[PDB]
Each structure stands twice: as C-alpha cells, then as structure tokens.
Amino acid sequence: VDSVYRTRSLGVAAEGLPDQYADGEAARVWQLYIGDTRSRTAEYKAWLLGLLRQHGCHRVLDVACGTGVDSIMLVEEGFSVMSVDASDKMLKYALKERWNRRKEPSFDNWVIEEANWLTLDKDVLSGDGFDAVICLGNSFAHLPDCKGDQSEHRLALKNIASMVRPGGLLVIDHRNYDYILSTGCAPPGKNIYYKSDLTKDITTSVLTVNNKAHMVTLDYTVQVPGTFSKFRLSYYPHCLASFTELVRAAFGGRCQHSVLGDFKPYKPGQAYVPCYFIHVLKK
Amino acid sequence: VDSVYRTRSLGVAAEGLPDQYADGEAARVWQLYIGDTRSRTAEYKAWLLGLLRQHGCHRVLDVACGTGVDSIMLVEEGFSVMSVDASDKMLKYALKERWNRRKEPSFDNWVIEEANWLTLDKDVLSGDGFDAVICLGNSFAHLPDCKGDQSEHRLALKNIASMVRPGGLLVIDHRNYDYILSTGCAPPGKNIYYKSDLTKDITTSVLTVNNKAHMVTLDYTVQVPSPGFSKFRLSYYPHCLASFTELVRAAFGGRCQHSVLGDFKPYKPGQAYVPCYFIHVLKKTD
Amino acid sequence: VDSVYRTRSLGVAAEGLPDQYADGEAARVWQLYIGDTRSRTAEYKAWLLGLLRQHGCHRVLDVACGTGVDSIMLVEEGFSVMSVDASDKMLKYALKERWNRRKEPSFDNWVIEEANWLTLDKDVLSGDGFDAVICLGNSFAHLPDCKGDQSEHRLALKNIASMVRPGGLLVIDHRNYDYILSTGCAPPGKNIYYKSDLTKDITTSVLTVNNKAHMVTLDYTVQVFSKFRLSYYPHCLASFTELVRAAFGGRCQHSVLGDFKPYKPGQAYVPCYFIHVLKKTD
Amino acid sequence: VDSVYRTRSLGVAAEGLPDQYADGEAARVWQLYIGDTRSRTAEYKAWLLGLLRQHGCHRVLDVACGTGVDSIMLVEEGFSVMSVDASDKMLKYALKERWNRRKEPSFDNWVIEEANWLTLDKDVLSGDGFDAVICLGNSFAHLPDCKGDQSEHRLALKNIASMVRPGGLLVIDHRNYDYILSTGCAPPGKNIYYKSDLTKDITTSVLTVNNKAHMVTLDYTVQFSKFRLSYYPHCLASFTELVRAAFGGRCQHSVLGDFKPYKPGQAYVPCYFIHVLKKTD
The missing domain is CATH 3.30.46.10 (Glycine N-methyltransferase, chain A, domain 1)
Structure with a gap:
C-alpha cells in the first residue's frame, strides 16, 4: 500500500546539495x-519621501521587506530603518545588498531581521513604536484566508498597527x-x-x-535571456470597502485615515480608476 | 484527468509567508x-591546524561550507578563507555569524559565496589555485549517483581538484x-x-x-530538552575506501601524492583499530 | 527536487491489499x-419511457452508465440495452447488480462494457447505429476542457452522435x-x-x-x-446547443427540454436540468 | 501557505472519466x-488437484483471488469455491470471466466477494470452516510490515487460519x-x-x-x-514460525520444495516454498 519513501524531510538541507526546489x-x-x-519610478520615490518628511518621520519599520529595495531607498535617504520579513529566500537579497554596501555607515545601521505578521508583537521589540511603518507593493495580499473568517487578516493588521507610535504612520497598500x-x-x-x-x-x-x-x-x-x-x-483579493474596514478596525477606530488613488488622492466614483490603493493612517 | 491546482510554484517565496517547508x-x-x-573536538582542531601549518598553507577554500564552523576556526586562526556551498539554508548561518562578528577584521575578509560542485570551475575564481582545499565532515557523500555510472562523482571530484594550486593540498574525507x-x-x-x-x-x-x-x-x-x-x-552515497581512493586519485590524473588517514591517525590496511572517518589528503606534483 | 521512492506505481494493485485510495x-x-x-422520481420514469416508446425506440446505448440505475430501468421495461462507461469503480456496481439478477432473462441480455468518449467510435461496435443513445444525470459535464479550446468536448460529442442511427435519438442533458x-x-x-x-x-x-x-x-x-x-465543466445553454448541434453537422432535429416539460427561452419557471433531445436526419 | 487544491478527491470517480491513474x-x-x-503449468495443476483430492477436500476458499485463474481451475474441476480479494482492479477480471461463463452451472455457483486479510473474520463467514483455504502465487508477500513488529502479518495469518475447519487444509506459499x-x-x-x-x-x-x-x-x-x-521478503525459518503460530501450534505442517518435498540443505534450491498445514481441532 501507498506511502512515499522520501529521501530527506521536506524543509531540510544538506551541505553538498541545493535546497529543496x-x-x-x-x-x-x-x-x-x-x-x-531596480528602476524605481520617480513618481513613487517623490511621494513616499514627500509623505514621510511632511509628517516628520525618522524611525521606520518596513514589514514586508522582501529583497529590501524600498528599505534601501529609505536607508540611502538618511532614515533609520528596520526591515523584517518571514521569507528567507527574499531576505537573502536584502542581506546580500547590505553586506555589499557595508562600508557606507548608513547601511551599517540598517537592521534586517526575521518576522511573521501573525507574531509581529513578539518578533519585533516595538518599544514605544515606530514613526512610520510601511507595507507596500501589495504584499499584504499574500496572506491567505486559511481559516475562513478573515481572522488571520484581522490579527496581521492589529499587529502591524501595534508597531505604530501614537501620532505615527501606517502606510499599507493593495492592488x-x-x-x-x-x-x-x-x-x-x-x-x-x-x-x-x-x-x-x-x-x-x-x-x-x-x-x-x-x-x-x-x-x-x-x-x-536570449534562449x-x-x-x-x-x-487574497482585498476589495476597497472591506480593507478600509479591516485596517481601521486594527487601530480600534482611534485613527485618522486617507485612501490614495495611484499616488494622488481618491474620491469615490472618480473618473480615473487606480491600479493600486494606498492607505495612510495616524495612531 | 487529475490536474492538481498548486497555490504557488515549487521553489518560490512571497513576502508575508515562511518558505516552502x-x-x-x-x-x-x-x-x-x-x-x-557547539563544541569542536580538540583532537580535530589540533590535527587540521597541524597539517595546514606543517604544509605552509595560507589561502584556503572550504567547498562544503555549511554553517561555516570549520571555516570560522580557520578565519580565527589567521588563515585567509573562501567558503562556498550550494545550500542557502545552510549558508544562512555562516553569513549570519560573519555579520555578527563583522567588526573583527579577519572576519571582514572572510569570503562566503555560492557554488556547486558540478560547476565549481566556473563558480569559483580559483586563479592560480588555493594552498589548501578542504571538504570535511563527510559532505561529499551527499552527492547522489543520479545517472548510474558514477559520472557526477567523477566530475565533482575533478572540479574540487582543479581548485588546488600545484604543490597544494586537497583534504577530503568520508565516513x-x-x-x-x-x-x-x-x-x-x-x-x-x-x-x-x-x-x-x-x-x-x-x-x-x-x-x-x-x-x-x-x-x-x-x-x-517529558521532552519531544x-x-x-x-x-x-556509501563510498567504499577502495573506490573513493580510485576516484579521487583519478581526479588529479594520477599526478598526485596521496595518504589516507585513520581517524586522524595514519591508516595501515587491515590495522587493529577500525576508523569512523577516512580522511584523504593530497598534494599535486609540481 | 529529490528522488521520491514510491512503494508501488500509481495505478497498480497487489492481491492482499485494497486498491490505491x-x-x-x-x-x-x-x-x-x-x-x-436511488428511489427514482416517477416524474422521470414516466418521461423517459414516454419519449423512447413515443419514438418507437428499442435498441439503446447508455453512454455514461455509472452504477447502471437508468440502464436497469430500461432493462426491466423490456428494452435491449448496451451500457458503457470508462469508470471501473462505477461499472463495478452495474455488473454486480446484473449478476445478482442473472436469472431474469432480460438481464442475461444486458450488455455492460468499457468505453471512453474520446474513443467511442472505436470502443463500441456501433453497427448501423442505436435507436436511442442516452447520456443523462449531468455526466457530460465531467469531461474537463483540458486543452483550452473545447476540442475534447467537440470530439466526445462527435463520437456520441456517431452512435445514433439515421432517424434515431440522442438524449443528452446538463445542469x-x-x-x-x-x-x-x-x-x-x-x-x-x-x-x-x-x-x-x-x-x-x-x-x-x-x-x-x-x-x-x-x-x-x-x-x-x-x-x-x-x-x-459549466456548460452554458447557448454554447452546449451549439456544440451538440455541430456534432451532427447541422443534420439534425433538436429540442431543449425544461425540467421535463418543454423550454421556451425566458419562460417564468427556471429549470434545474436542461435536457436536449436530438434526432439525426437520414 | 503551501498545499494542494486537487480537482477531485484521491479515490473518487466521475462518470465520463477514467479512474485515477x-x-x-x-x-x-x-x-x-x-x-x-496464463498457460497454467501441468506440474502445478497436477499437484494442487492431487493434494486437494488426496485429502478429500471440497469446500474451498481462495483468499488472494486476483484475476481468479486458480479459482477458475477449481471451479472447472468441480470444487465448490469462494474467492475473495481486497483488490477491485483484479477482482474485475475474475467477475468478468464468471459472467462470460455464466451459463455453465458450476460457474453460476462460484462466489466472488470482497475481503481484507486484516478483517477476514468479519468479511467472510467461515461458518464451520472451509475444507481447504488456498493462498498461492506469493500473494502474502504483498502485505507490507507497516508497524515494524510483524504484527499485521501475525493478524493476517491468524485470520486466514481461522478460515480452516478442524482437520482442514491451509495451503500458503511464498517465493x-x-x-x-x-x-x-x-x-x-x-x-x-x-x-x-x-x-x-x-x-x-x-x-x-x-x-x-x-x-x-x-x-x-x-x-x-x-x-x-x-x-515483504519472508525468509523460510521466519514464515514457518509465523504460520505455525497462527494455528496456535495446534497443527500438522509440511513445507514443499518446488512441488516436491523439501528437506533442509538438500541439493536442489526451490523457487517457491509451499506450506501445507492441517488443523487438528
């Protein structure tokens, strides 16, 4: 009868061999x-930097780090940035870039660390909070609704929100x-x-x-390449209405909140229909 | 027919989520x-350092780096060391230790990089060769005989050997x-x-x-450590002593010096003591 | 990857052991x-029998046999029926029933045999054709659109339709x-x-x-x-009509039934099944 | 989150489609x-029929029926035979042959039914037992050692032995x-x-x-x-122990060579080992 003689456990590694898949x-x-x-739209650069500085932000948490391209942008522009992710395969690339740029002192003080949204409160020592937490490039939509009620979304969001200082910023988007x-x-x-x-x-x-x-x-x-x-x-297809609800609830209502268009503001029922929806709030 | 809808490809990652398995x-x-x-045997420490220095070695290549515990011992002892592996999961730990110890200068000059035995000639810039190349802790036995002839073994060994400078050392072991x-x-x-x-x-x-x-x-x-x-x-792959000797010698094209070690102690065929590891150390012949 | 070492091939069996899953x-x-x-609706029994005798049918092909419950109804009512399916697990139950009732002569002459829609022309000796070929209980919707064009549907339907004699009936339904x-x-x-x-x-x-x-x-x-x-596969009414009509090459007469009663487009009542009944012109 | 969303469950079927694999x-x-x-060796047919009639058997149980070729041999030779298997893919072929031969009366009285070794006592109604229970063609070797102790083997054999009526025969072989x-x-x-x-x-x-x-x-x-x-590679010593134990020592036991008798360490080395056991109450 039918079980599968595996050669090594799923998720292990040996020294000679390339990992899993x-x-x-x-x-x-x-x-x-x-x-x-790696060719960042000037549009974006200008906005994010505009926003962070217009709100006097300095201490930043990038919670969906990935290869760290946004963090690098902040780390270059003189912000002090902590970046976390739960993907080793992606943090690989942020860590590799930092090391490459290790002589630059701004990059010496870039902190890259591991963190899961569902445990962000015990993974990142918040302290009193960050001046701004960002989660852009549609990354929150990666988190699936595994248990049916959107309960894990609601926990990911409360936690991300828990990283924000009073009078601070959460910038979180979705397609x-x-x-x-x-x-x-x-x-x-x-x-x-x-x-x-x-x-x-x-x-x-x-x-x-x-x-x-x-x-x-x-x-x-x-x-x-050429071949x-x-x-x-x-x-997870977050609709605008729902997500607004979700994210607002994560702060327990005691927030401000604006929904951005593609980078410029969003009036409901606009002529222009945006590609991304950016939500910015302040605790 | 049964067309199983995967959620994401095998081998990809997303940002929120932990990798594959x-x-x-x-x-x-x-x-x-x-x-x-967490505690390297003094036995070993003494031997490897003994060998390397008695042969005047300085520029070292660790080709089955792993979490880098052997490379770290060499870095600390003042060698100049390049460490490669093909496993990201394991290099993670070597790179993490390096970064942790980044202010120590010797460690600032430790090189950690990706490389695969089947492509080691392209993956590592050997240059003139390394003074000593090491592949210990039975790591070569990881490489399976996927095709049936031991052709990939023969290529992996020929490549590793290609890393050694003339008059240089290859230290490779197997259980x-x-x-x-x-x-x-x-x-x-x-x-x-x-x-x-x-x-x-x-x-x-x-x-x-x-x-x-x-x-x-x-x-x-x-x-x-009622525990779990x-x-x-x-x-x-169960490399027998005869076959491996053959294999590794051939990787140099016979142009070598070859001794096989006991447990760190020389090995006389049909000796009283039976060793747990078999270490082969090799010079090229100039 | 790495080298998965299975205990036995997918699809084999050993004697001691229960099959696969x-x-x-x-x-x-x-x-x-x-x-x-089970407990077959009187509604249905009356319609199907009605239609078949209504059109003087005798030689029947049930092409999505299953456990044979429709076949059995026809077998009992004196028709002469060949039933085929591609599923062994299901034919198991038609065969078992036939053997159980082997003594009744009408069942001794029930034919149960293996057949795939994609090869029906070569799997069933269609001879001159059957008086009626039925494919009911939404079974055609099992066949997926594995390519992308509905090319396998088109072939399955063309095979099925090739089982019908000239002046004969295809009865095929979908939800x-x-x-x-x-x-x-x-x-x-x-x-x-x-x-x-x-x-x-x-x-x-x-x-x-x-x-x-x-x-x-x-x-x-x-x-x-x-x-x-x-x-x-969610066959919409419009495309299926298309599909099945094309299987006969336009050379057909065609009506679509409501729930057993006729179907006028945009009628008040919305049906649960759509039954297509098709007569191949000689 | 990393796993499947299959098109249909492992082990189901739909009407249009060929099964699983x-x-x-x-x-x-x-x-x-x-x-x-399937051109049955004359060697074999002579031995099996020799043995069964030698011991006056009539009511037979074939517990690893398969496509029923041994069963058919018995059916034809006038025995009254029940054959069971746990494999549908194989029983298919036994059932298909019976139906094909349905008008021959001995075949009308051939019984083909589903049964698992682990539940044979609850799957077949032994009644008082069968005159002979057969399990040939190395089929018992299919049953793996899934637990680690050979506990399932010990249960399969116990169960199988329970099908034999007192003074009856179990014929079971292994390569x-x-x-x-x-x-x-x-x-x-x-x-x-x-x-x-x-x-x-x-x-x-x-x-x-x-x-x-x-x-x-x-x-x-x-x-x-x-x-x-x-x-599962059953060695001769082991299996002897195992099958003997299934009767609780309350048995008479002979091993067979290739169909001949087997004396330990004889010149000829057999391909199959046949064990024939006689219950004594």
Missing part, C-alpha cells in the same frame, strides 16, 4: 521576476481588486513603484467559494 | 541537528562505509570533528540495487 | 453518494449552469431523476480563467461529518 | 503482466526470499504456476533497515514500458 524551472524565472525591481474581480483579468506591468524591465505574460484565475471571492492566482509566463518559462503566485 | 516538524529538528556543532555496509548500521554520535549534545537515535537503511550498494538513508530521531520526539531523514 | 475518508462518503442515486454561474451556488438535492434526500451539504467554487468560466467544483459534506469533492 | 503507461503494462501469466536476499536478485520468469509468456526484464532493490531485510522492490521492464511492485 531551488533550481527548478519555475524558481529560476521567479528570481528574474523579484529582481525586476485594485475591485477592478480585477469585475474584469476577471489582472493586467501585467502596471507596477507603480518599479517599472518592469521584464516583458511578462499573465493568466488570471479567480476562485469564488460560495459567492465570495477567495483567491486570485496568477500564472506568469516570462521570456528568458518561455512559467511560475505561479496567489493573492 | 521551513517550519514543519522535520525542518525544526534538523536545525537542532546542524546546530550541535567508513565499508564498516557501515558490512554491519548495516551507521552508529550515532561518532562525529570525529564535533561532539554532539543531542541524543539523536538512528535507523540505518541501505538500498542495494542489482547487488551494488546505492544509498544509505538515515532516519534520525532527535530530542527536545521528532524525526528527520538524510541520505548518503 | 479505496478506503480513505472521502471514498467511503462518495460511495454513499453514488449509491443514493442549468447559466443559473449556477449567475448565482455562484449549485443548490443541493434538486436531482430531478433520483429523489436524493440524504443530509448533503454543498460549497460551490467557480474557477474563472481570463474571464471565461472554466470549472465548478463542489465540496459535498455528508452525514455518516465527512466531505468529498467533485468537479464539472 | 487507470490509463497511464505503467498501469497499461501491469495489465499485460497480471494477464499474460524463496532466502535465495533472493543472499543473491540480491529476484530471477525473472520462474513462476511455476503459470508460464511466464511475456518477455520481462527485472531490477531487484532490497531495502534493509537496521540490519533487517524489510522490502524487495521489483522494477519490471516489459516489451519498452516499466512498472514497479514490492514484496
């Missing part, structure tokens, strides 16, 4: 994708999923933070469980 | 395991698989380099295909 | 489900997926063929790829609480 | 295998795994029940856990497609 086909192309950071769901397609290469130097082809799959949007799964088909490869990633 | 039962115990390096196969057991806590402080419990499975030993798979059952019993599994 | 949680519940295809997709729910216990009351609980998931409905996947939660899952 | 390459070749071991493990190869086309009519090709893999033989896995390469099957 690290050099398959799909991982290969996915690196190309996470690496098509326009109101658009995506009503269209059924998630358009390629409209990233507003980083212009994609990478021509890449997208198939949108929406899963709807009992009349409730539950997952948007994207299969990216990227073309490879077509595929990889897949999934998102 | 990173915090399953077995991975959590396996970290404890790769981490019980006594001649004993393991004839016993059928690979005894726990015999590590000749690092005395372990977990009460690992071990089951040895040998796979024999068409009468040729092909894999030795170990299920370690480790402890949680957790398991994880790791496998090894 | 045969007695896991889900499988056991699913048997309860396929087996509650009202126009309703399901616009609602997003596929309501439980509305099987108009087999009054299926049994405490069943249903979650409907729709997969929509690049704006085109592509799968409806149902997780049944049944009272033993155990869940199992089954999926369907 | 039923028409992948390996299955396709495996059918050829389970099917093309010579003492030979196989000392050689490391399990030789192709040695089947002495049925002429191995397919040209096969065989690779033997032995798994030895902590110095105890645990699995013998065969990759068959048939004329080129490949499939794989695994066996």
